[PDB]
Amino acid sequence: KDPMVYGFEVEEKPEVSYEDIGGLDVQIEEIREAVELPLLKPELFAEVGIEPPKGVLLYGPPGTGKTLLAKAVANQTRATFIRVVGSEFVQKYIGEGARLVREVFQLAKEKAPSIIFIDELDAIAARRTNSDTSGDREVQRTMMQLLAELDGFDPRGDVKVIGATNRIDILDPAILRPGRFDRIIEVPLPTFEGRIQIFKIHTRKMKLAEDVDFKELARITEGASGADIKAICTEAGMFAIREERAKVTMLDFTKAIEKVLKKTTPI
Amino acid sequence: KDPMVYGFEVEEKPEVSYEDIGGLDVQIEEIREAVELPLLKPELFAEVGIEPPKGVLLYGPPGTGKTLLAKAVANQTRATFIRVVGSEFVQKYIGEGARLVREVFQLAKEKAPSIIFIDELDAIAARRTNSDTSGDREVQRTMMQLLAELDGFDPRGDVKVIGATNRIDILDPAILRPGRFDRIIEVPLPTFEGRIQIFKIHTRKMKLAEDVDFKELARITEGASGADIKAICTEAGMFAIREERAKVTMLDFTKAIEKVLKKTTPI
Amino acid sequence: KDPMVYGFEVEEKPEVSYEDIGGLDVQIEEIREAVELPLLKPELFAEVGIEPPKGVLLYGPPGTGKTLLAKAVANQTRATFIRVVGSEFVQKYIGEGARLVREVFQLAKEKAPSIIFIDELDAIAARRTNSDTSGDREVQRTMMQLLAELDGFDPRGDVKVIGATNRIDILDPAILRPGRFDRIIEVPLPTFEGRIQIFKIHTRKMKLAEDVDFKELARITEGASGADIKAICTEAGMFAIREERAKVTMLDFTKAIEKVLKKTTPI
Amino acid sequence: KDPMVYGFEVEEKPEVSYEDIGGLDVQIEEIREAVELPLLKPELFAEVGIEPPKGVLLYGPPGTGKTLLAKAVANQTRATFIRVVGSEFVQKYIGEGARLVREVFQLAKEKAPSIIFIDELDAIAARRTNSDTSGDREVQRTMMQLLAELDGFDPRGDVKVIGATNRIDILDPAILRPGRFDRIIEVPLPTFEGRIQIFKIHTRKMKLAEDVDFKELARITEGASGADIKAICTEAGMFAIREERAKVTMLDFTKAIEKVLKKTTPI
Amino acid sequence: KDPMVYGFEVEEKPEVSYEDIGGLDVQIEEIREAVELPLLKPELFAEVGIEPPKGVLLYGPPGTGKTLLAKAVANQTRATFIRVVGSEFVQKYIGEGARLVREVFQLAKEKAPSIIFIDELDAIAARRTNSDTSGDREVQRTMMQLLAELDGFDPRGDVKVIGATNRIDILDPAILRPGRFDRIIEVPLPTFEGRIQIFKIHTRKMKLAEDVDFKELARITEGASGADIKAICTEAGMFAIREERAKVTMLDFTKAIEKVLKKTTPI
Amino acid sequence: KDPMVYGFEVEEKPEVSYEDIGGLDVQIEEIREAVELPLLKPELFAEVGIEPPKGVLLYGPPGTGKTLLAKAVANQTRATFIRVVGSEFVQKYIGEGARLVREVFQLAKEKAPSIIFIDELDAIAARRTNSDTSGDREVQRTMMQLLAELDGFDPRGDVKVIGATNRIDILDPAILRPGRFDRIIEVPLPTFEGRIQIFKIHTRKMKLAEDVDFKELARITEGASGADIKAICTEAGMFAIREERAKVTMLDFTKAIEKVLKKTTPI
Ligand SMILES: Nc1ncnc2c1ncn2[C@@H]1O[C@H](COP(=O)(O)OP(=O)(O)OP(=O)(O)O)[C@@H](O)[C@H]1O
Ligand SMILES: Nc1ncnc2c1ncn2[C@@H]1O[C@H](COP(=O)(O)OP(=O)(O)OP(=O)(O)O)[C@@H](O)[C@H]1O
Ligand SMILES: Nc1ncnc2c1ncn2[C@@H]1O[C@H](COP(=O)(O)OP(=O)(O)OP(=O)(O)O)[C@@H](O)[C@H]1O
Numbered sequence A, B, C, D, E, F: 001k002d003p004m005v006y007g008f009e010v011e012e013k014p015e016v017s018y019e020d021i022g023g024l025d026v027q028i029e030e031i032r033e034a035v036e037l038p039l040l041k042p043e044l045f046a047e048v049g050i051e052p053p054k055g056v057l058l059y060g061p062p063g064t065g066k067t068l069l070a071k072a073v074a075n076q077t078r079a080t081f082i083r084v085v086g087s088e089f090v091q092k093y094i095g096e097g098a099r100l101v102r103e104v105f106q107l108a109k110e111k112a113p114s115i116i117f118i119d120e121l122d123a124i125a126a127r128r129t130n131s132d133t134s135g136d137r138e139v140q141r142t143m144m145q146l147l148a149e150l151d152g153f154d155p156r157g158d159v160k161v162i163g164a165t166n167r168i169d170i171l172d173p174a175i176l177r178p179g180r181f182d183r184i185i186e187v188p189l190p191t192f193e194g195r196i197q198i199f200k201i202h203t204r205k206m207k208l209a210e211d212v213d214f215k216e217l218a219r220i221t222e223g224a225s226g227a228d229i230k231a232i233c234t235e236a237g238m239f240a241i242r243e244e245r246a247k248v249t250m251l252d253f254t255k256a257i258e259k260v261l262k263k264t265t266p267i
């Protein structure tokens, strides 16, 4: 009953895999497993006795590759990858958003095995409630619907809903609890070695000089996220273009670390 | 009229069943008194001469369990278990919800004995504040139909409205009270012994455990919810296969209780 | 007659009479003089030269048996009790609501005297703020229709639109102001004499009780509502059932009183 | 002879004349000069040089008696009085419907001089969203149809348009522009002298024995409305029955106002 | 083929070049490298093996000419230009604001290459911590929807935002980080030199000074925005009409510097 | 197809001109400099090289017929007159407030020349909050879209607008900034000589007047507006028809002044 199945991009697998992400290695493995083993290895569960987890919640500072973690799971279990955005519920008609939730779930059930990937939970959950609010009351009646098709009366299924958000601090605690969203995976800012892998992903695409030491660059870029690193390389390339080289030398990388980081914040 | 799955649906199939009556065990006895005792033995109500309780309002924090409770009971009764959901009301068009509330209830009378488990509908029922906005007032109307049909003017038959709500800090005084339920149930976080009963079921499913001490798990899991415990159990399974074991060990619980509460309990 | 208003009428032998309500007590007598006194005797209002009430408004604290009292008066008027519900009005087009208010008043003019009981005046006539727009506008659309008929321009005969509301102020000032609903009878919470009498209605239908002291019973249940007295009674009776006796005694009440009291106090 | 526009007239002179409406007293004269005088002789209005009202809107808080004043107009124009409800202008489907709006105005042109009263413009000149489809289009359409039609037959008296509205703040400017209505008569809540007069007329029909001072009661009932006074009277006679006196006296009104006033804006 | 979002596409083909605006000459070079240049020659990005910039985020005062930098670019690239005022989004009809950014984005992919200018990120950015319980959540739904399309899942599509803001400290963390706006550009009030350039352009549109010297004027105009340097020129022309010369010269220009500053700084 | 106006009311070629205006004689000439004469003479925009005026704001004491001047400028330039009322702006949300600003801008480009009358400036012209508050915020997101759009315009399609306000001293200096509103015109409360000339306009209409001395009338109406002078003349015709004479003289004028205008004195 969905022409919104085009807005769920059921076909077109992404290009981002586990090898297009990295330096968040501990995180890849739990989330990977939380839907990968249930689907390809369900006999392993039988034998030990294991309950299938019914979702994974992801949170973390912005730009750490949450989006990328989701894409990688979607790509590499190739089974029904339902991408929705929580901001996509709630319309001008009086409880259309909640109707709309019921549609995703009945659709996922039919098309099961299925993984639902929700981007942004901050536009569809609130940890407060309030009564007689214009912008914060129907969004609580499409949340309340949600709680409630994911697990509730309606089984299980084979979802496995991957939630993603930029802050869990303004999210309703019903989402926040396990039993559905059973592995609560924090994704932190990357570490010393971590910033080094992220560098090499973009650099793998690029040409470089052979006096390029990642270890030195990663020292400078301490307290920055994966998104700051992508932009550093990009911007470093722009310096390569102006000066007409088909490679990025070490000195551009240091210019870029100074440029990008400086124009974000003065720590 | 024209009923789709709406309430009409009746199902009571597993996982939640009459042998996964995890609790919170005094609380289950209270549901059995309210619903199942006049259903199975009506003559006892003729001797006292009371009106049999008309509904069980279960409330609590999330995941503590009330979906639980209500389905486990429902399989026992073998009654017409009416499943409606918490904002399937007013789909896009208006007063739609008021016609659903009536429909559900009228069919229920015909199919009485019948039980109406409505997920979160008590929480949608909220107060109005003057002047203030015209709201969001229109959904609150759909609540008023529920009061009228339950025993407001039109007899119940043998309904048995099971309420569900994540807050008692969101309700109008006119749903809260014992008058549309009567049997108002606090479902708190599971008792010391209560908590051991939840682990028992899960461990049963998870074969061999021979060094695990469930009581000790209980001291560590002080003031965790019922859905929390089930994820603890799930992650203990997971660490079991990460150590490549056919059974779940005592370390495996220690790690999962540590992981599960950390991400979800504030400092 | 279209199905609509066919089916609004007529409730044959209502449960509830004045020996199935009692305990308040003065405002009971006031309503009964207000509707039953000119219906059974038009002469007394005629001799002074006054107009009987155009309607009677019931408001205030939930649980005081407002709709219950309506079901009492219906049994002794036998003047045609039109049961419409404030939420029953309004559907998926506008003016289809209007149609229904126009139909009930035309129908009533013929049955005159007759009782139009509108469950919630506030559904179809709520305190506006502005258009937010789907059904909110329809509400003040419908309010226009109800006025209009009442004795706005069109002969009322001897109706007698009797209302009730869940909240103090949630209604347009027009309806609030008397001269349309002309007696504003606050049904308040029962008196010291009134709470004893309420327990008595229950005692009538719940067999045996003499170790109970009605006065002291009432004294404890201060600040409760008629629905709460009923709820205690149903709880008490379950208490007795647990100790297996068909007599209700005081100890059964004390346990039952506590259940309700836990909710509402500590202050 | 379409049943809908034929059914909106006539009563062959309603109940109420200017005699039976108590004092305002001076704003009665404004209405008499605004409506009645230009109807009988627009030829005299032209000869003077002035332009008669496009329409006259009655504005004031509820209960001042606005539609009460319209019944008075009705008896004394002698020109066929249209009682229509603006709630019936918007309808369930279309050009019944929209056409009904042009039909009423056509009826006026052949019945002329006449004298069309529409009655509340609450929810037929409010704001639309452009649009919410089923609600809005009806209201937006009917808004335009009203304004064009009254404009195009009044440069000068032909068909006089009268109306009234509950408030002029609950609807957006549309009918407030002096291209449309330019003469809006404040129908206040009544002067000190006005109350005394209303009290007088109501006791005029009433059988009493003289010791009443209508003036003392007026000081008391300052800050009410004419409909409350009517109520005070009906309750003052009802009191008379309860003492079993077939006469009303001062003691009874003083008491009667105390009851009514109390359920109302306060002592 | 809906005029509702198709109207936002091309602005009749701009007339504004990057030599019709200046004074922000450093900033102009930056914008061209990031946005224009990919479109100009793809192979440079291939050569260095980089992912091309997302685009530019401009911040700064008001009047600076953020619009004019998008207008310039659009003329020069020979590609789709979609100009949207970003504060126009956000409706009091809940989730219509989010719908509108969703469609503009999807349409941008249909007509790729495309540039969108989302002006003012102030009124489409909220504060997570409470300040307006209904205003923050609403704004947030619009914000996280446009972000969703921006790189939540759905590709760039060779879009190319390009988007301005008065205040950058009011933005949520989500949009603030790069990778949804790759190159954050400071665009400050005109420098010393910046005055002289802006002036010169605008006086080439007039009759031009006869007694040229923009350095004197510049000293005085320091501490104003770019619109304000223009503004003086326009004030100068009209002053010319009042004098009865209608030719602009240094005397009109200096008298204008004074006349606009009279308002501005208040000695 | 028939056209149906939006941004109501619209008068394409309004028939009120400056012949209908008297005693505001130099205020006509200033505003002819502001909009009229620029617009019909495109030579000025080449002979000076000036970039057109974008608005002129009318100020000084209210009630003077600021709407009427606006119509007279629209008449002269043969444009589409468009009315924006400020009461249809700002609620306590936003967005349809915003929408309607957009609407009249769209209509105005489409049908240039076009005169957007913008009363009233005090509900979208107000001060800034940078210490924050919530109520002020509604106004600020509305206000920026007026400010922007007017500057956004292309010189292909000239949408000149004429503002009007009661108090300029409560508004932001930002809308008193040249290149938005270039000049302001004190339309003052009428002088002695002004009042005599405004009575004469109305007298054209009125019959046999040869006893009326206009001077004694102006004296009495010290501190009277133009809307009040016009209203006095309608009322004069009412008084004349009360004394049963179609001849309007001076006695009628004197009673009309007392009745309408004289209320204000004493202080
Ligand atoms: N884990 C990482 N590995 C490699 N690249 C990364 C990593 N994190 C971020 N990036 C780069 O930064 C870009 C932009 O960040 P992205 O859009 O992926 O973030 P997100 O964490 O979902 O953000 P938000 O909190 O704003 O929703 C990526 O497309 C990638 O090029
Ligand atoms: N007491 C229990 N024993 C065993 N497992 C439980 C228990 N309570 C909850 N769970 C498990 O937790 C999961 C989700 O919780 P459930 O649906 O029962 O929550 P609820 O308290 O009704 O919440 P919400 O406020 O989100 O509607 C199910 O998998 C259920 O079996
Ligand atoms: N005076 C009374 N004596 C006995 N029982 C009473 C009395 N008044 C109320 N009750 C009981 O209280 C309950 C509520 O009655 P009712 O169904 O009339 O709702 P209400 O007070 O109109 O409610 P709402 O605010 O939910 O519309 C019933 O169970 C009724 O039997």
Ligand SMILES: Nc1ncnc2c1ncn2[C@@H]1O[C@H](COP(=O)(O)OP(=O)(O)OP(=O)(O)O)[C@@H](O)[C@H]1O
Binding pocket: C147, C151, C152, C174, C179, C180, D020, D021, D022, D023, D061, D062, D063, D064, D065, D066, D067, D068, D120, D165, D166, D190, D198, D225, D226, D227, D228, D230
């Ligand atoms: N001046 C008056 N003289 C006599 N009776 C009055 C007076 N004013 C009001 N009433 C009484 O009030 C009623 C008529 O006015 P009513 O209260 O219906 O309101 P309205 O001002 O037309 O309201 P709305 O805006 O709700 O349509 C009658 O019952 C009448 O007896």
Ligand SMILES: Nc1ncnc2c1ncn2[C@@H]1O[C@H](COP(=O)(O)OP(=O)(O)O)[C@@H](O)[C@H]1O
Binding pocket: E020, E021, E022, E023, E061, E062, E063, E064, E065, E066, E067, E068, E198, E225, E226, E227, E228, E230, F151, F152, F179
């Ligand atoms: N730097 C500048 N060079 C030339 N014109 C300018 C410059 N800055 C602003 N303007 C002009 O001033 C007017 C309004 O400024 P605009 O660019 O719309 O403002 P904002 O930065 O607030 O978006 C326009 O007519 C615009 O051309």
Ligand SMILES: [Mg+2]
Binding pocket: A066, A067, E152
């Ligand atoms: Mg993200």
Ligand SMILES: [Mg+2]
Binding pocket: A147, A152, B066, B067, B119, B164
């Ligand atoms: Mg639940």
Ligand SMILES: [Mg+2]
Binding pocket: B147, B152, C066, C067, C164
């Ligand atoms: Mg009730």
Ligand SMILES: [Mg+2]
Binding pocket: C152, D066, D067, D164
């Ligand atoms: Mg009325």
Ligand SMILES: [Mg+2]
Binding pocket: E067, E119, F148, F151, F152
């Ligand atoms: Mg701009």
